[PDB]
RNA sequence: UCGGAGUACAAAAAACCCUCCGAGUGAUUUUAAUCUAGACAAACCAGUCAAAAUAACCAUAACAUCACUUAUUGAUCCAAAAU
């Protein structure tokens, strides 16, 4: 019974730290999505 | 409402006029009620507002007025929508 | 309270909870507030309305007053005209 | 604490929600009714870069006033 | 100095009474009230003495 | 509850019914003691009478 | 409260002057 | 069935103003230690500077709407003087004509005491009040 | 357990001694005006502007949209002193000033408005209203050339739609008519579209008048695309939004995939999205107009259903979420009579075995 | 018996024949309504606030004010007065 809580506990953290690493992925490619969505930005640039 | 002969050719127009937002498409009057759980009383109810509808209506100097909250702001909302109207160019 | 009494041996009640209580066959008892006709220009208009509503009694009290009252005015009454009639059933009473 | 948004004030000075949501505290500048004399003449002594504040209690609204459903299609 | 305690009824002839605190030194009172029997402000007069 | 004593044969329409014959069904209980004067109809099932 | 960094943002009686009030008995001008 | 005549039973509508001009949404309710009072929809902002008189019109969420004011070089070149009581009343004129091409009708405005009997002020209102701008806003409905 | 604040305090830079030194406010309205400017700086503790709803506080707008017109400030700094001193000098001027009696010329202020600073004061009325939020989303364009619409109601009388009116469907029942200085050298684009108002969708709008390729002034002169079509709001849901767009195009450019049928009564050929249509055209079409009216429901709706949309009239309602109560006691303590009053379900009383 | 400050230093509560101030009502008119969501407080009895809605009056008007404003007060039964 021990041995099953330290593989238990072993893999849940292992797991939780893979979760985070996936967000911090998922935050930086939505950042840079919406970078390649919006338009061309004319304004002032057409004169210039 | 057409084709309901027991009310007066004056009375059955004065009903489309005033009560034109229940008229459905193909001229059927629709009355609904929802007051008590019994349907006996629900039908009484019905006959009875078509009563005072037709009532109301039947009387030609019957023409009561009211004075409501909403309808000092629509009087104004009217009012300023004729400011800019009272211009008179060439139009398209 | 007796619980026996000499004559008859069966169990009597107080009269006093019944001159000023009223009992719907819910459980719930019913009784005014204290105070409500004490010096009453002292009082503001809130006070006021609030000493002439009536109240529930908890569950002590409502215990209570079971327990000083015989069984004959726990049942189930049918009056003609009684403005509490609609009250006497619990509904929607989810525990 | 000075009433904020959505959150009214009783004759005994206490704070009652007007509104249901969420409950918030908030540091805020403090200008006095001018019909408040006592409180317009201490404004009126206050050094020129000074500004009074205030601790306020907001309730930010959760549910919408209300939304539009279809009832009958005639 | 004490004061009395009188009971004004309405002139509006309805049957509406409320009790009101008065100087003894001062005069019968007359005021503006609101009974709501009429649900209008009528004429209010002092008429019985009660409590000092 | 009137139409469930008709419908079991409890009472029946084609003989006039009346006090007596509702208490004979075991349709109402009365006593006279608790200051009862008899049985008032209510409208519970007007619909599917 | 103490323990918060904004305590003490609401400090207003160092900025005006203690004003003492002209007592009844103590009216008297102190120069 | 008829491709056309497929509605959802609920519909959502986006116009921040539809509830604003149904007199349905929500006041901000309350301070009332505070002045002036933030229970409004659109408040009369009027700042009487030394050189320049700016009128301004704000929603509840501090942004403007609409604005009059003679620092404009619109206004500025048909003006005498910037800081005369005529001065106010061509702002008044100019900023009630904007308010109802803007559909703005009604606005909440909260003078001081003393600004309540300027003359400059008193009059400016007498410009809003036939220019169609009609202050104290309609009550809510269910408020 | 003192802790040390989190940047500046806000009193901490005038001296405590040396009271007197200080020079006060001696008013009220010198403190409201110190107070509302130090109200709208971004404190580091908590404040009102950061709950309720400032739209992410700082945004970087995108500008799509014509440069601004080319003004030299030396040249219009001389002129317009210059223009002031002749009025300045006038006697005449003077007396009527003294004596409260002048008025303007309020049709020249408007004039002369829509050239100087309409296009500013445009720009915040759409962003007010939303529409740049609902159309290009973040991204914002400045309406520098002045559009006109008005609408043809009696047999002289015009109906005008400027920025934010509101405009009965009554009026609008026939097509508008568009007046806009432009010279004969480039191309324009219309496009009315009606912001809320769709029914299976709410992220979509429908088009009511689309014209490609207008030559100058002459609108009509223009190709046309999408048939004008009657505003056509809801009973219930009122006050829907519609935009007029004038986009101008270098090009000649293939507007045929959005070609519309000419007897178009089908709504769901009417979908549309501004955003997606412009991201298309991005690189021919720019935004340079704007104008949106208001539009609430009337008699003139109920027509467009029948006879031209062959559709059944939907009436909506503002609905009112149930109000609020607290879970029940078996044993109200204290409470009134009515307690039992706000868990009934229905008011018909209804019996059991009875 | 009732209120305020310290003891009780920062949510609440917290004692002594503990240390100090008070209250057992006046002045004035703005004479302050009816009805109900939701809560603070609390052994109980009591005490407190209160949106919406209706009426009153600027014709889309409810906090009586001031005196440290906080305390200025008494349950049933019973008796008297118009009910
Ligand atoms: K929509
Ligand atoms: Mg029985
Ligand atoms: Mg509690
Ligand atoms: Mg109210
Ligand atoms: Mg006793």
Known sequence: KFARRVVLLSQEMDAGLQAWQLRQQEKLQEEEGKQKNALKSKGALLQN | LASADWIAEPVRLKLAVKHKNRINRSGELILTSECSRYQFRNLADCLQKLRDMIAEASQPAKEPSREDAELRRSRIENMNRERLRKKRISSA | VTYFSSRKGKRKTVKAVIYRFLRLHSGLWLRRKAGYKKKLWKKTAARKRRLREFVFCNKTQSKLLDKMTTSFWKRRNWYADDPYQKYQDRTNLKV | WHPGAHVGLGKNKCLYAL????????????????????????????????????????????????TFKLVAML | SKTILVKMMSQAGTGFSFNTKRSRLREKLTLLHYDPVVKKKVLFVEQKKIRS | RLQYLIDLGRVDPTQPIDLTQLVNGRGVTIQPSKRDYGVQLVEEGADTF | YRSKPTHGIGRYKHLVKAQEPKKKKGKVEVR | PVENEAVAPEFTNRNPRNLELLAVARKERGW????????????????????????????????????????????????????????????????????????????????????????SIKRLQHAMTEGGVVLREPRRIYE | RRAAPLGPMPNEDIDVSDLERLKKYRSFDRYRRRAEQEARKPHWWRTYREHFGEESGPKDRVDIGLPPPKVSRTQQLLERKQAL?????????????????????????????????????????????????????????????????????????????????????????????????????SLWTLLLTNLDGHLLEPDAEYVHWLVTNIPGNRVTEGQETCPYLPPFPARGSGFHRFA???????????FSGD????????????????????????????????????????????????????????????????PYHPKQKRFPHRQPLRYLDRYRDSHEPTYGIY
């Open chain 9, 244 to 254: 007029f767009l004038l986009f101008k195009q270098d090009k000649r450019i293939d």
């Open chain 4, 19 to 66: 509104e249901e949501g969420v409950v918030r505290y908030t540091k805020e500048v403090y200008v006095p009714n001018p019909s408040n004399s006592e409180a317009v003449d201490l404004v009126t002594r206050l050094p020129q870069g000074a500004v009074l504040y205030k601790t306020f209690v907001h309730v930010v609204p959760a549910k919408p006033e209300g």
């Open chain 9, 85 to 185: 001193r002749e009025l300045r000098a006038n006697v005449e001027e003077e007396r009527a000033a003294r004596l409260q009696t002048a008025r303007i010329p309020l049709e020249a202020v408007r004039a002369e408005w829509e050239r100087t600073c309409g296009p500013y004061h445009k720009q915040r009325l759409a962003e007010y209203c939303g529409l740049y939020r609902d159309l290009f989303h973040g991204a914002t364009f400045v309406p520098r050339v002045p559009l006109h619409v008005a609408y043809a109601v009696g047999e002289d009388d015009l109906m005008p739609v400027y920025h934010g009116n509101e405009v009965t469907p009554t009026e609008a029942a026939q097509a508008p008519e568009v007046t806009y200085e432009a010279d004969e050298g």
């Open chain 9, 259 to 322: 070609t519309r049928p000419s007897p178009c009564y089908q709504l769901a050929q009417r979908t549309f999205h501004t955003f997606d249509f412009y991201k298309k055209h991005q690189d021919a079409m720019t935004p340079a107009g704007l104008a949106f009216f208001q539009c609430r429901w009337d008699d003139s709706v109920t027509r467009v259903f029948h006879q031209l949309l062959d559709m059944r009239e939907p009436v909506f309602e503002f609905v009112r979420p149930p």
């Open chain 8, 32 to 119: 009332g230690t505070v002045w002036p009072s933030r229970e409004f929809w659109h408040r009369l902002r009027v700042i009487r500077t030394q050189h320049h008189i700016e009128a301004l019109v704000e929603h509840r969420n501090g942004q403007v709407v609409v604005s009059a004011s003679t620092r404009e070089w619109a206004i500025k070149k048909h003006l005498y003087s910037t800081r005369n009581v005529v001065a106010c009343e061509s702002v008044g004129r100019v900023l009630a004509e904007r308010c109802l091409e803007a559909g703005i009708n009604f606005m909440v405005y909260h003078p001081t005491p003393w600004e309540a009997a300027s003359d």
